Structure formats: structure tokens, C-alpha cells
């Protein structure tokens, strides 16, 4: 688990584990057909331990699930192309206005363009 995940509150930490687990189900699948049963299985895995109230056991489950989600990070995340980490992100980025263009550059003081040696 990263520092940002650790600093999160318990409710949001379990939410992060569920979100990352679902995304890793998507990454490790071969198609959308594999996703649904595996998503239901992850659903049941979280639902099984939701009613535990013993803090120490809950900490054990969260830590073990975080280790499992760290090990099964996919080498190739499935990311939409237009978003960060995507193929078409930055291919031809839209160029902004207010560009500093100097018109007729060579005709501004044409004879006296050059470097000068100034002395004391």
C-alpha cells in the first residue's frame, strides 16, 4: 500500500481496495465475459468480512488484501486511450492561443543586427 492509501480513512481504504480489485479483474481477464463472475466473487469476498467488529482481525484482512492487490498489479493496465497512460494522449495536443510571433523579423534594424563588444 502507498502512503496516500494508508492516510485514507477506513471506509475509503476498503473502497479503494474494492475499486483496485475490480480494475485488476478487468486487467487480468481475457474478455468482458470473464469479468462478471469474478466481479461477483470479489463482491462476496468483501461482503463476507463486512460484519466483523474486531479491529485487529479487520486490520489483518485489510493488510493481506493490500498485499494481494500489490502482487497482482498488471504489467499492462487497460486504460482508455484519451486519458493519462493512453496511446492517443498527447498525439496532437490542442495548441493554445496568445502565441508570441514576431512579424518581419529580419527587417527590424537590418543593417545593425549583430553582437557588439562593449568596453570600459
Amino acid at each position: 500500500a502507498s502512503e496516500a492509501v494508508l492516510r485514507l480513512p477506513h471506509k475509503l481504504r476498503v473502497m479503494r481496495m474494492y475499486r483496485t480489485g475490480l480494475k485488476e479483474i478487468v486487467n487480468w481477464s481475457y474478455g468482458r465475459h470473464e469479468f462478471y463472475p469474478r466481479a461477483n466473487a470479489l463482491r462476496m469476498e468483501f461482503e463476507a468480512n463486512k460484519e466483523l467488529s474486531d479491529r485487529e482481525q479487520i486490520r489483518k484482512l485489510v493488510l493481506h488484501g493490500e498485499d494481494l492487490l500489490a502482487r497482482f498489479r498488471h504489467w499492462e493496465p487497460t486504460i482508455r486511450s484519451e486519458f493519462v497512460g493512453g496511446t492517443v494522449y498527447g498525439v496532437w495536443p490542442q495548441h493554445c492561443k496568445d502565441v508570441k510571433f514576431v512579424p518581419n523579423p529580419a527587417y527590424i534594424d537590418e543593417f545593425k543586427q549583430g553582437d557588439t563588444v562593449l568596453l570600459y
Binding site: 475509503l12 476498503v14 473502497m15 474494492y18 475499486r19 463486512k50 482508455r80 484519451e82 486519458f83
Partner: protein, 83 residues
């Protein structure tokens, strides 16, 4: 393309219906997930399903801030890559 609120509302309402617990009239353009009857783990699934519906990737910290039907529509409207 900036997608108008009315269409985004229709599609978010369409996604929210598929939860069995949620009753088809409780979902309104302005309703929190709690009144709909959705849990936290359910809100994860709804945020993801919104990701397929509009073809976008929700960065996670914003995903936490989505807890209502209203703000989800606002986030989708804000996004210029939402389809």
C-alpha cells in the same frame, strides 16, 4: 464535447436503475446514494458503471467525492472527454 445536463441525467438515471435494491421511482436527478439504499461497496460499482457509460476514467480521489446522484451528473458535465 460538452455534453448537456439533460442527457447526462438520463444516462445516470439509467445506470442507477440496475441495482435491485433501488426502487425505480426513488432515483431523482437530486438524490443521495444513501436514500436510494446504496452501500459504500455499491457506490464503487455505480461509479465504475458510470465509467463505462460515459467512456471516461474517474481518478480515484474524485471518485470518493461522488456520493450523490447530483454531483455525479455535475462531474460528468464538467468532463470534456465524456461521451
Amino acid at each position: 464535447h460538452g455534453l448537456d445536463r439533460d442527457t447526462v441525467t438520463e444516462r445516470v438515471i439509467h445506470v442507477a436503475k440496475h441495482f435491485e435494491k433501488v426502487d425505480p421511482n426513488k432515483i431523482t436527478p437530486t438524490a443521495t446514494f444513501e436514500e436510494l439504499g446504496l452501500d459504500s461497496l455499491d457506490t464503487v460499482e455505480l461509479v465504475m458503471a458510470l465509467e463505462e457509460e460515459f467512456g471516461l476514467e474517474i481518478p480515484d480521489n474524485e471518485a470518493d467525492k461522488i456520493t450523490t446522484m447530483a454531483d455525479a451528473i455535475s462531474y460528468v458535465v464538467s468532463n470534456p472527454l465524456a461521451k
